[PDB]
Ligand binder design. Structure first.
Ligand SMILES: [Zn+2]
Length: 183
């Protein structure tokens, strides 16, 4: 589960301009409601933070899966889990994930992402492709969701969310490209 992020670390890593430059980390946020015989018994949620440069799988998406398996995934359960990530995933992790999913119906996942990482690369595209196609919701994190993250996952000091400019357009464009990839 880790720690929440100070406001700087958040607004910086969650800034949604498609070509932002200097974001050497994927910040992965999540809410998860555990659900045993249909009654949600508990809710746990958190923030994993690591690098995005390809050295194998010390990728945020994997440190997630390792933790999920160590301290959770009980035998007979159903999980509800969703992700607020700063960068979309690499394609290799998009693999290990989509796979773990096809291999566990008792996990339902949905992905909200500030940015599409390398959205123009046939290979990254095909990753997103197999996540959508294999039972995961995948969409571009917009206003609703940003505010959501400002309150939940950040040491905000009970202060209010202040949007950055273009956030509305930045969203609009990323979603155009995304519905494009999947079309
Ligand atoms: Zn990765």
């Amino acid at each position: 589960q880790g720690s929440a992020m100070d406001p700087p670390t958040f607004t910086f890593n969650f800034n949604n301009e498609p070509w932002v430059r200097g974001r050497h980390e994927t910040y992965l946020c999540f809410t998860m409601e555990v659900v045993k015989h249909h009654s949600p018994v508990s809710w746990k949620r958190g923030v994993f933070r690591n690098q995005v440069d390809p050295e194998t799988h010390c990728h945020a998406e994997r440190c997630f899966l390792s933790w999920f398996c160590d301290d959770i995934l009980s035998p007979n359960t159903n999980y509800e889990v969703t992700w607020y990530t700063s960068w979309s995933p690499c394609p290799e992790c998009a693999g290990e994930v989509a796979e773990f999913l096809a291999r566990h119906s008792n996990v339902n996942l949905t992905i909200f992402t500030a940015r599409l990482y390398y959205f123009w690369d046939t290979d990254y595209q095909e990753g997103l492709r197999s996540l959508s196609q294999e039972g995961a919701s995948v969409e571009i994190m917009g206003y609703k969701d940003f505010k959501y993250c400002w309150e939940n996952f950040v040491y905000n000091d009970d202060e209010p969310f202040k949007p950055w400019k273009g956030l509305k357009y930045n969203f609009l464009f990323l979603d155009s490209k995304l519905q494009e990839i999947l079309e």
